[PDB]
Amino acid sequence: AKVTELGYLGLSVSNLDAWRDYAAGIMGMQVVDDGEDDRIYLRMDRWHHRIVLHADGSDDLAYIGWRVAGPVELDELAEQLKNAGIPFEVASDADAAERRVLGLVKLHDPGGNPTEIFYGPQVDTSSPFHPGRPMFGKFVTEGQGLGHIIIREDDVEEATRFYRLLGLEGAVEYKFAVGTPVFMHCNDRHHSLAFGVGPMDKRINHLMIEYTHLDDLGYAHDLVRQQKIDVTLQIGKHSNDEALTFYCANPSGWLWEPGWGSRPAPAQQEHYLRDIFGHD
Amino acid sequence: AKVTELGYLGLSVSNLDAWRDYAAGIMGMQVVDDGEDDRIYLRMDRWHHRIVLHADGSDDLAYIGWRVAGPVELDELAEQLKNAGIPFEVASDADAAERRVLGLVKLHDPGGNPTEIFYGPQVDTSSPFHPGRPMFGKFVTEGQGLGHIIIREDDVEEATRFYRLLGLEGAVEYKFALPNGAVGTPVFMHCNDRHHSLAFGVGPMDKRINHLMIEYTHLDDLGYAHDLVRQQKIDVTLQIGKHSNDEALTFYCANPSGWLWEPGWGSRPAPAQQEHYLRDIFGH
Amino acid sequence: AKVTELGYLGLSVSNLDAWRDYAAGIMGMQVVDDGEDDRIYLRMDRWHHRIVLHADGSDDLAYIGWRVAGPVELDELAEQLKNAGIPFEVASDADAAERRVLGLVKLHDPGGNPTEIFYGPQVDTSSPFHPGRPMFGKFVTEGQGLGHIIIREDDVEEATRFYRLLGLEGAVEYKFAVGTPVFMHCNDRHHSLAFGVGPMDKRINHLMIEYTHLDDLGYAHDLVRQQKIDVTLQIGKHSNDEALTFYCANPSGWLWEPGWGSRPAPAQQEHYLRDIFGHD
Amino acid sequence: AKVTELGYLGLSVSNLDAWRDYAAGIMGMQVVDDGEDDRIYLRMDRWHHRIVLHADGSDDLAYIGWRVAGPVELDELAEQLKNAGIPFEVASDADAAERRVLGLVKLHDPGGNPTEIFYGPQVDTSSPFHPGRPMFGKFVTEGQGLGHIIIREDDVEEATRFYRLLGLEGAVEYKFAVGTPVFMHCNDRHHSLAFGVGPMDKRINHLMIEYTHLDDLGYAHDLVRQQKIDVTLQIGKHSNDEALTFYCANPSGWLWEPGWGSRPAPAQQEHYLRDIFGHD
Amino acid sequence: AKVTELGYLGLSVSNLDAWRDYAAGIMGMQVVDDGEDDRIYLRMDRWHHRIVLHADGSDDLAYIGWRVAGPVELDELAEQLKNAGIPFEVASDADAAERRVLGLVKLHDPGGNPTEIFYGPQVDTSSPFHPGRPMFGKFVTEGQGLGHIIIREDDVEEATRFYRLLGLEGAVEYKFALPNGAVGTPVFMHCNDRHHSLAFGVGPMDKRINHLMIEYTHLDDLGYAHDLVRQQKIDVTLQIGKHSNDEALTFYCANPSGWLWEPGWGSRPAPAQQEHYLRDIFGH
Amino acid sequence: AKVTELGYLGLSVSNLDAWRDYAAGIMGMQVVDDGEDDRIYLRMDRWHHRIVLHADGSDDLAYIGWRVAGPVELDELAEQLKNAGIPFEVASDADAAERRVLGLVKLHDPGGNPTEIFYGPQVDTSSPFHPGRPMFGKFVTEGQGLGHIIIREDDVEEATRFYRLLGLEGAVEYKFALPNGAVGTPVFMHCNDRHHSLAFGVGPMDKRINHLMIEYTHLDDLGYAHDLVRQQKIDVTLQIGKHSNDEALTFYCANPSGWLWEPGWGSRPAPAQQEHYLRDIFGH
Amino acid sequence: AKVTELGYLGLSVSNLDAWRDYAAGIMGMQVVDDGEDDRIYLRMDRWHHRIVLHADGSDDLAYIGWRVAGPVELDELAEQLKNAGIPFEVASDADAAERRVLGLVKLHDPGGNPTEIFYGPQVDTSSPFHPGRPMFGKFVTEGQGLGHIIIREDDVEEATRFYRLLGLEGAVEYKFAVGTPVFMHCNDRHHSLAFGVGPMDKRINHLMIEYTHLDDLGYAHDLVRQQKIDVTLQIGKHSNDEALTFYCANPSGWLWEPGWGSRPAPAQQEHYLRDIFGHD
Ligand SMILES: [Fe+3]
Ligand SMILES: [Fe+3]
Ligand SMILES: [Fe+3]
Ligand SMILES: [Fe+3]
Ligand SMILES: [Fe+3]
Ligand SMILES: [Fe+3]
């Protein structure tokens, strides 16, 4: 059994309203507020949500959810963890219900990042995704997860071995003291996960989200320029994912990377020395 | 040169608010309001609009706009009308501006229905379609027009001839027995892949327009619309069903102007060749 | 080895003639009467039959037949049952011949439902399916079974484990005391089997049958309206199978669900809270 | 490891010239005579030959050759035979060279039929197949073998178990004392092998060969009528292979079944009670 | 019979070396030098060339060459020009040789822009395209011509009519407010799959040509070009963006003659039918 | 209405036996002998034949047969010839029988080459093509004709005009320097998917025909033919190579009548539009 | 784990300039000179290089690199070697960096040929392949390796067993004392490797490189004729790969075989007695 996608992210945020303007108003996500006093959701497709916003007054990552196919696969994965010596917790039904999933395992990666493994997300088929701003197209999520994240690790090699155990595949992809970021995938998305990018003040460095239509990235690019917001990396392409993407600050003080046209991971490992173009 | 699609409809209404709730809130169209005194717009795709709503107090059809490919084609059609001795007005640039088109000709069909032929609709490709209720998919319009309409014609043969001149094709599609032994023979006509764009010969009518069909790309949006209408007790005069001709899955129901909208899914193209039916397939 | 489809159903019925009018006259199945004094068959495609009508004077389920690929797979499955502690019976040749199959294993599921596992159904290739009323198209059966059934179970978890052992895959699909129906598949049909829907007076709740052509469902819908028969659920869509279907009473006092446009099961487990539209 | 196709047949024949008129002159096979004093070959495609004609004065089967993918697969298959208790002989290089193959295992099936297992047939790529009469099209052989054969067995069940060990798959396909012919396949050809058809005077009952073009079967049908030769079964279709074929006597006193439009074997076992049409 | 593509451009330049560095060194074109005194060539595909560079001292457009399918088609177009009372020169074999074509007619458009119509370009299929900087892919030209241009026209309606005669199709593509309440209505026209080959009506211009669009098959080549231009501080007058009409991803920037090149990727075809816009999609 | 393909060739030969060995034994054609005194046939596909061999003592081309779709089309072409004042003979049913066709017209091209136009060739669909040496594949002929030929024309422009009337399309395909400063401009023409069916303007010729190209579906048959020719020392006057125009892989070599056959593989279609070359791609 | 392609070759050469004229000037490869004093590279596609030219004054093979998918596969392959008794060396990071790979295992085949196994080649995505002469098309390398090589072995059977252990598949393909060349593949390229061709003065007999466009082979054929260079085998086709190729001398005194239109290896082993055409 292997994880199949990056299913959801929990975020700790200090300012819900600013996140509404940003994620729905600019990025085109749908705000879902089910009445809960301490959280709201962000929806990108059929699923009830892909991202949870916990208004706990912090501004960092709360948890990463990795999907598996069903209860049998969840059990096989739990057993693999037990055999590897890795502490985990089979969540109760009520804890799974909090996450809007049927079954859920909670644990941590070797960098201390809260990591969850689940099957059976809540899908709202009867209430179509309705974007928070006008969209030409949709988001790329089908079988591919919500996007990709760079997260903090203190032991790159331990993290890699942990993530291969979960089912992800990958290796170092750039050589840039030579530093060696590692990139990993579990489906057709080039990667869902990367680490070893150097010292980081927060648990998460960025999140790349992907549009089906190029016109939606331009629409977002222009809203960000009009709203006169911080751009860290300009429009361009990495050698690895070969996607067209830009990097801007979110209300939590880290980066979102809205994108278009990401390719699949090569079936065999490669490594690069530099990006294709842009990203200035 | 011929008409290529049913491009837009002008509607006279007496209650804008009801229309907004109906067309956007249930059907999923986008309300476009340009700050005009007397009118708002309904949008279904990239075009600035497909339906104009003139808040004038009446509840009927105001005008029907038929698209042609371009200026040369508009000239060619104008000359054909003149050579048929059909009167028409060459609209100026301000009349074309008012309709959001590049050029147009204004006229009447034999039944007195105000009829426009235009090229160059306004398309808002910077502001994508944003439906007025959540939608699963979109509207079927590309190269097919807004949908199909049923309109009043006192002279069926005169209307048939008028619309063959414009470039529409078709003929009688159904035969049915009337009370006195007569035979009703409604005429259905198309100008593109859409089974038909136009019909008439369905008998006496108190308004110029009887119904409008609009088509969803996704059945679940038809399902959704149906559900809100049941939630809000609107008159579905004809239940879910298939006509023999268009072989579409549709339900008929009442709009705020007192006539019928027929939301539908899965319309088939107009056959290569003319055929007719005595009855429909199922439902309705 | 795994079961590949829901191959056949045996029904106990009190009124054969009424079943002829219903299943052939309305639904478009073919009545096959081979001279046997206590039964007649219903045929939907190439197979000799998909359903057996036993005129024993009862009005419920008699047996469920699950197909396997051949004698080797039947043996591997019998061995899996022996290893699990589940009593079974390898039918004799004459018992297999009664069912019109080459090899047959008889047993019961944990709810006490008679369950059969077979290979090699009788197929009448030289006598084409001829519908009991005029049909635009056909039934959807190829590699997909005859349709799907909701059956009674007293132990939802035991039933699930039993059915996974047989080769089916699935889980809970709706949360609606929270009740949790389970749905299962063994091929491209969304599901062949569901249970845990609540208390049931009979062994079987319904049977969904599927038309290739939409026009055939309308034809049946209209015959049911003309014959002024009981409709329990109106035309609509479940979130899970995303099929267009209606629910009406059969002469045995349970439901048939004639349908159109059922999709495959998602490759990974999901759960819903409500249907898409209709089914009032 | 499994056998992949029915690769070649060795025949013992009493009259080479009559076989030339028949197989090349009517059927459109190519006569290959490499100078050997006791044999000539029949070629149907790229291979040097598909059939060997041994002029030993007998009129029956000499051997059946089953192809495997290479030397590794040949070894795995030899090992499976050793483990099953089945005597075999690894042919020497010179014995393999006689057969025009690189590696060859000789043995017998439970009915005593000489059976060979080989890899690496001689292919004459530089000398295109040239038919013995004018042909519209070609023969169907690619990845499918030369055709199919009914052979004699005294123990139907032993033969089946032997043939499954070799890699073939199948079961009984007709019920017609009820007799139960077994049909087996190892590729896209409906079957390569059948037995249990009742008492037979010879080792082989027939050989079906298949044309790509319908017009070639008609051409052969007409030559057979003009030459006023024996027809046993008229043009028609079996329920199982669903091919269009006729049955005529060859100069050895058994049947050839020239054919067209044979379908693949169903992915799951079926059984019939009668043919579709024809074969009178 | 009609023009089929924008085949070549003749350019007057004052500095060959700068052009070589710009067109080849950055854009990826191949410099072709045939040992002529006064001119070199720029190549983008199998054709001997798409752009001629006459080192005469001026910095402007010299001529525009439009392709037709063959000799019969050239005759047919010649007769149409004559029947319209438009003057033209039938070039001799040496004039055709100079242009690397089999036949041609020379003339002027209403704005005085030297205009040629030809069949039979020279194609060097023994010496494949070899770009002047490493390229990921190639240029989009097949049956689409070199790209599209914006040129000076004092009389927009006269030019429109002139180019409909040649066989191009199109009309006004945008409307925008001018200072005095006027409406600018630029005309965009096509003769093949390329959205447009030609535009004008964009206002006063000091040179005959305003810009040229060239299209890469691969985005990474657009990316590459963009990067070298940033490395060499050339004026990108308009940043990465999409026009509503061609829906292409392009950036505008200055060439050594003082006007604009617009390298681009992913242009869409010209719609079956005329439509217009009030604004563009994004960027620029 | 136009010619659709080069249908057949009539050849005068002085040695049948050599031809049989060459055309069948090496090229893979089928010899068809109908028991006629004076002639045998060469077959390449379903047609009774593509080449007639008249054993009359001369070694040259006898006639060229061009196919049209049917009788109406033959009439239309006949009337076009008459309206051009080109003389022709309407063949009777026995003349059509002799050619194995349903109808035909007989005439001359400007260079005196006997020229026939026919519909309805005889097709032997009961006796499939059986090649005269083992073949891997077949000949390319469907809707493309037998191949292409080079023929003698004293007046290139007159011939061009003659063949545009018949319905062939094309123009000059190459330019090359002659000794005296002149320019040779051979004309290549097509009437279907085959790059060309016909060429001329290659200079002085002692026979009416210079070469014939035939095309194999499979390269291995080209390879096979090449090998037998090397085994039998026939003159391959031009080695394996690609022309710029047809972009085919072919080798030229001598037949028993003293002129050239060019067996080939992988010919490309004639481009949508006319283009020309100064040289060829490789080899030859 | 198996090797996936013939990734790179190291060559020892006496004359760098002559190799530049040959490989770039004629063949259309790109010369990459990164400043190193003892070597330059030849590039054929995205990779930094496919061939290394070591100017050590010798004129033969230096090493053969076989690609594997990643570090896990490299480990599984290293373990297979340890289990087989075959000495190997896990290269250090700096040794892998010298080769422009992320991980590297060094060893020898049974003929003494230096053999390397690596994952993660350096790819220069931001600097497109730019040919050393004008090219119509490109080289065929994607998932197929750089081409194929005939190398020297003293023990044909040992070499075969060694190469099957690495993941390659194959056997004897020609019978021509009967000699028996062996051909092997690990992807869609007919073969990457062949040996047993008879006595050889050098470690490598030839290298076949493949063009996507036929016109590029003709362009090279003509440059070789104009430069009036040695041709050993004329244009033609082998029965096995069915490619169109010619054989000419390189500045190191062995053969390059520029080619076009090579087919995949047959899924099952064959053997031939002669080539199709040409190669005189
Ligand atoms: Fe990223
Ligand atoms: Fe309607
Ligand atoms: Fe159901
Ligand atoms: Fe048979
Ligand atoms: Fe532009
Ligand atoms: Fe030629």
Ligand SMILES: [Fe+3]
């Ligand atoms: Fe080779």
